């Protein structure tokens, strides 16, 4: 008790320093940033808030623990007030309440007592200006607490938080409208909680009402004030509207637009993965293979850990349907290894034309396939493997007989061997000629690709894309 | 051993000598483009470090 009793005082000063300077310096800094300039945005604290909360999402959030009483939530939420520079005294009052935790008996004002606290910024008379600071006071205390996931009786409190956070949406659309630029700051802030809107429902049930609320918020941002707002809502769309039926595949056609400009970076790279699984069930391989490969190289930076790793696993699903793939252990990670072991030997059975090995993989690894939901391909991937084998033989041989290719690919019958090549020319797999007597397959080499003609036609798209990057460089150089 | 440049024909039994050794467009280009990758990779240390 004496040793553990003296170790309690030191830690809470640590959140009283760095966590104190998190929302007070950024919020107090964004104060003058949102009063003017306000170019663009920028508002560099908006992306700085991303460097904080995401760091808070690991440690310490608001809590912890930390051997405090979790009185940081009621601390900053009261006495905003606010006014002219005397608000600096409110930060001084926030320091005076720090000593209350370390001197008197500390009590927990969170949970049941947070309902009157969320109404305080409106009851302080008044905010009077920045909703995001109240939105932050309605999020940074409450939203990092959701990662506890106790699920008992506080889920409705997370719903009551979104109720007053929807009252902030009432002040979001109605208030300002004159050179606002605070919605663009909220478009990053309101996205997070809107992702938490899904997280709160996903632990109970799918949201039927918020889907209608999504289309209401989706169209109301167009065209009046939209920056990154419709794109973040489009992420909420394709996320749940994919996993849940139905018709939402073709729904993307009327939403695009694009929506330009893609913001920000990897946000649209994983979006290309979301619409990539769409095109994966659409069976179009050409557009699906380019959107998945682009999603890998355009997604920074990790670690950690399996977020980018597990999302890359299902990303090569379109590559398993291409018919030309190498072994996937080059994308393997030691942390993702044990998880992809059923998915590892999978593509090993794709590289082989063996029917016994392909069926044994589905039978043994079917337990892992149930959590993936990938069974759509396993029925038609047999035809993809036989195209990998026939392309391997046709590229390695000029003439290939139907009797020799029968047992080597264990087709066992001449009739279906003719049915494979008949629809191979329909699919453009091979130019192999067939002379019908018994019959046999006598083909000839394909040529005339050469150098001059076709490779120079591709160079037209190569350089026209290169000079577009010149335009991308001119646009980027002109911002500073 | 490069001492003899030519190719034979087994069917009709004719040894045909043909050569076009010099290419100044491909070799002087591709070698520099591979070197151009080394110029960017060495600059990737400047790029990533100055940003973060």
């Amino acid at each position: 008790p004496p040793g553990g009793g003296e170790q309690e005082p030191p830690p809470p000063p640590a959140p009283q320093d760095v966590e104190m300077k998190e929302e007070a310096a950024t919020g107090g800094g964004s104060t003058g940033e949102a009063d003017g300039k306000t170019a663009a945005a920028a508002a560099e604290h908006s992306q700085r808030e991303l460097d904080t909360v995401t760091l808070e999402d690991i440690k310490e959030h608001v809590k912890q623990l930390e051997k405090a009483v979790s009185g940081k939530e009621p601390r900053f939420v009261l006495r905003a007030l606010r006014m002219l520079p005397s608000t600096s005294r409110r930060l001084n009052h926030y320091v005076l309440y720090k000593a209350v935790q370390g001197f008197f008996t500390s009590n927990n004002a969170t949970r049941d007592f947070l309902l009157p606290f969320l109404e305080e910024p409106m009851d302080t008379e008044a905010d009077l200006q920045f909703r995001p600071r109240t939105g932050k006071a309605a999020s940074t205390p409450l939203l990092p607490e959701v990662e506890a996931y106790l699920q008992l009786l506080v889920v409705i409190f997370m719903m009551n938080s979104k109720r007053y956070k929807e009252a902030q949406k009432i002040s979001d659309d109605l208030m300002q409208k004159i050179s606002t630029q605070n919605r663009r700051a909220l478009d990053l802030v309101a996205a997070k909680c809107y992702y938490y809107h899904a997280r709160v429902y996903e632990f109970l049930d799918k949201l039927d009402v918020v889907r209608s609320f999504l289309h209401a918020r989706l169209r109301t941002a167009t065209l009046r004030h939209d920056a990154d707002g419709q794109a973040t809502l489009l992420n909420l769309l394709l996320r749940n509207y994919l996993h849940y039926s139905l018709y939402d595949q073709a729904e993307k056609l009327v939403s695009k637009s694009v929506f330009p400009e893609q913001a920000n970076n990897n946000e649209w790279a994983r979006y290309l993965y979301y619409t990539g699984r769409i095109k994966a069930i659409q069976l179009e391989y050409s557009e699906a293979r380019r959107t998945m490969t682009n999603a890998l190289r355009k997604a920074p930076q990790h670690t950690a850990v399996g977020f980018k790793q597990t999302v890359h696993k299902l990303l090569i699903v379109v590559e398993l349907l291409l018919g030309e793939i190498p072994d996937r252990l080059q994308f393997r990670q030691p942390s993702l290894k044990r998880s992809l072991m059923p998915y590892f030997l999978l593509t090993q059975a794709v590289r082989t034309g063996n029917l016994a090995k392909f069926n044994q993989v589905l039978d043994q690894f079917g337990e892992k396939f149930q959590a993936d939901g990938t069974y759509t391909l396993i029925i038609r991937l047999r035809h993809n493997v036989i195209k990998t084998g026939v392309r391997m033989i046709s590229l390695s041989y000029s003439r290939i007989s139907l009797a020799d290719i029968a047992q080597k690919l264990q087709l066992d019958s001449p009739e279906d061997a003719e049915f494979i090549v008949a629809k191979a020319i329909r699919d453009g797999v091979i130019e192999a000629s067939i002379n019908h007597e018994k019959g046999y397959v006598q083909s000839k080499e394909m040529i005339d690709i050469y150098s001059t003609r076709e490779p120079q036609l591709a160079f037209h798209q190569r350089i026209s894309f290169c000079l577009d990057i010149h335009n991308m460089s001119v646009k980027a150089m002109r911002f500073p | 051993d490069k001492k003899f440049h030519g190719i034979l024909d087994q069917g009709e039994g004719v040894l045909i000598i043909f050569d076009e050794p010099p290419v100044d467009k491909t070799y002087e280009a591709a070698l520099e483009t591979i070197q151009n990758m080394s110029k960017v990779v060495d600059s990737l240390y400047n790029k990533a470090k100055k940003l973060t």
């Binding site: 000079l467 010149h470 | 280009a29 100055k50």
Partner: peptide
């Protein structure tokens, strides 16, 4: 061929050196 080959290297001279020199002055000014 001389078009596409050289323009790709000219782009490598235009794109790289610009982003370097621009990232230098931009972020170190403020």
């Amino acid at each position: 061929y001389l078009a596409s080959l050289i323009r790709s290297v000219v782009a490598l001279h235009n794109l790289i050196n610009n982003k370097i020199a621009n990232r230098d002055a931009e972020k170190k000014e403020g």
